Write a protein that binds this DNA or RNA. Structure first.
Lengths: 68, 150, 121, 191, 52
RNA sequence: CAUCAGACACCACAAAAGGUGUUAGUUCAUCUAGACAGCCGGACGGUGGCCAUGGAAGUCGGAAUCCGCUAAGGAGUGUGU
């Protein structure tokens, strides 16, 4: 008998989250969060996947469960 | 032998002792006349620390610095008739209020004679304590006799 | 006059550090003005008691790393209702005056500091 | 200003264990079991270890962070009510008519019965909630004691008892006669 | 005969209140604003007046 | 957040005055030189100061509005007599 607080486990933004860009000129690519600006905008870069370094909103992109 | 301690107070010559000293085996009317032998100089309002050893009235005199500053002042009044305030401003005593106030049991935590001589010399609100000035603003100018009493 | 009083506090604390060599940190808590006034009257000869803001003592020792860094071992011992006693008598007589005199039914000495080291006394 | 994260730390002592499914919070310990439904408040529980539970609110406004702090207060109060338990002492106020307070069983419903209040004839009756027992004080005159687990249950029965003895159509500062919460302590005698 | 250890607690619950100036709301004695929405949560308060 | 929501010119109305309801901003002071709030203690001595003396010691009432120890404590913020 212990503390059974269950999970409520999300995927967090951080420096180094890899993201799936789903709207725009990229529209389905990978990138990585470089430097996090505020509650809604982030700064992403996708160098091998091709998308140039740019700021984006967190509505245009979805977080993937992988990190580095 | 027991210990009884009372604090008698301001009276002119023989000026409610019965309610305070009935349980210490002492008198009521004879105790009022027993305090006349101390506060009779000393005709200014002061206190008397009475120490009754359970069979007699033995009153002592408490050393009061404000009453000693009033002892360097004018005593003129008799009883109940001066019709305004029964107060009188008087002589300065620039050095007599510095030896007597520094000898009244050295109260207030003084580390100098200019400390006690200003604590009991700048508290003048009935006397002038100067020939051409006033008290309570001379504490920063009284710098004499500090090494003599200490 | 808050800045000038704090500058006065820094100045007098740097003054009383570099003049004395015997420190008694005392764990005095809820002490009365009847006890303290008879401490001010008694210690007129050798010791200087200094109470006051022990978390202002924190910054005072923060700023005093350049001169005499051997006072670095005191900020873990400023915790609790403590004060300072500055004297030149090393162990015995000051500890006999502070602890034994004026007890009723909190005047102890919790740290003794002599020239860099700490002593249980 | 939309705080990015706010947190509180709930300290869980030894003899009790929490059990949180999504917001249904049960706390079990040496006096019994307590449950509370926090689904209306949207806060996030995170076990850091057996003794410490961090709660957190991300991206919340001002009312949301206030809700977080009162979530901490409620969980701590359940944990205190299951470790120690709560105990309110109420002492009467009566000028001329001694208030006669009993506990009677009317079909198993356990009513506190207030009689003779300011010379009234209305037999005032108060329900007792669940969990709270009610004792009468030894060797302290005219006192009643409510002891139980929940803060809300004990305190609410105390307040519902107090407000059955209000005074209508009088000067409420002259006729002070009533039943009043005196002391708010714990069941454990040491604490 | 109230035995004023008992009367002090009653005055805590009946006398020691503050009263709103606009809606007469019986407020807790150290409040800064009236809790009601109908007087616009005002700051005009007063002590509840004691006995004589 | 509205137990009187608001909603697009003319056009079919609302004001002075308020809110520790919420969001920003200006200025000053404290400010990180551990403040503020809370809890635990002090909250002195001259001094029942001078007094009107049944009695007034901060406290029916009047004017002076001081000094020493201070880390701090007022010729006192009311209550009590």
């Amino acid at each position: 008998t212990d503390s059974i607080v269950k999970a409520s486990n999300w995927r967090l933004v951080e420096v180094g989250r890899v993201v799936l860009i789903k709207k725009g000129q990229s529209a389905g690519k990978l990138a990585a969060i470089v430097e996090i600006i505020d509650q809604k905008k982030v700064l992403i870069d996708g160098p091998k996947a091709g998308v140039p370094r740019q700021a984006i909103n967190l509505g245009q992109v979805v977080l993937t469960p992988l990190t580095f | 032998e027991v210990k009884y301690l009372y604090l008698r107070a301001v009276g002119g010559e023989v000026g409610l002792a019965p309610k305070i000293g009935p349980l210490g085996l002492s008198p009521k009317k004879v105790g009022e006349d027993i305090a006349k032998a101390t506060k009779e100089k000393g005709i200014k309002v002061t206190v008397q620390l009475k120490i009754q050893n359970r069979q007699a009235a033995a009153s002592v005199v408490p050393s009061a610095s404000s009453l000693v500053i009033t002892a360097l002042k004018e005593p003129p009044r008799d009883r109940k008739k001066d019709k305004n305030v029964k107060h009188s401003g008087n002589i300065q005593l620039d050095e007599i209020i510095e030896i007597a106030r520094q000898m009244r049991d050295k109260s207030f935590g003084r580390t100098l004679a200019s400390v006690t001589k200003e604590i009991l010399g700048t508290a003048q609100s009935v006397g002038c304590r100067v020939d051409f000035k006033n008290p309570h603003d001379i504490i920063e100018g009284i710098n004499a006799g500090e090494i003599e009493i200490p | 006059g808050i800045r000038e009083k704090k500058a006065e506090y820094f100045a007098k604390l740097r003054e009383y550090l570099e003049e004395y060599k015997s420190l008694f940190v005392v764990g005095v808590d809820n002490v009365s003005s009847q006890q303290m006034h008879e401490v001010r009257k008694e210690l007129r000869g050798r010791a200087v008691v200094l109470m006051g803001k022990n978390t202002m003592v924190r910054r005072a020792i923060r700023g005093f790393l350049s001169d005499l860094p051997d006072f670095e071992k005191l900020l873990p011992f400023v915790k609790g209702n403590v004060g300072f006693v500055f004297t030149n008598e090393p162990l015995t007589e000051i500890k006999n005056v502070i602890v034994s005199n004026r007890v009723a039914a909190g005047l102890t000495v919790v740290q003794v500091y002599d020239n860099g080291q700490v002593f249980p006394s | 200003m939309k705080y990015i994260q706010t947190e509180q730390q709930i300290e869980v002592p030894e003899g009790v264990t929490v059990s949180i499914k999504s917001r249904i919070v049960k706390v079990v310990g040496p006096r019994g079991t307590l449950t509370k439904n926090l689904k209306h408040i949207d806060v996030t529980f995170t076990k850091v270890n057996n003794q410490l539970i961090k709660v957190a609110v991300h991206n919340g406004g001002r009312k949301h962070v206030a809700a977080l702090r009162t979530v901490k207060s409620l969980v701590d109060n359940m944990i205190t009510g299951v470790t120690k338990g709560y105990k309110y002492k109420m002492r009467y106020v009566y000028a001329h008519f001694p208030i006669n307070v009993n506990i009677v069983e009317k079909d198993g419903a356990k009513f506190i019965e207030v009689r003779n209040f300011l010379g009234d004839k209305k037999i005032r009756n108060v329900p007792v909630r669940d969990g709270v027992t009610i004792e009468f004080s030894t060797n302290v005159k005219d006192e009643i004691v409510l002891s139980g687990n929940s803060v809300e249950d004990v305190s609410q029965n105390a307040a519902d008892l107090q407000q059955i003895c209000r005074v209508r159509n009088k000067d409420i500062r002259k006729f002070l006669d009533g039943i009043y919460v005196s002391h708010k302590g714990f069941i454990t005698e040491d604490l | 005969i109230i035995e004023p250890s008992l009367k002090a607690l009653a005055s805590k619950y009946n006398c020691d209140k503050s009263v709103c100036r606009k809606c007469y709301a019986r407020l807790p004695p150290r409040a800064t604003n009236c809790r009601k929405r109908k007087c616009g949560h005002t700051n005009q308060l007063r002590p509840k007046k004691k006995l004589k």
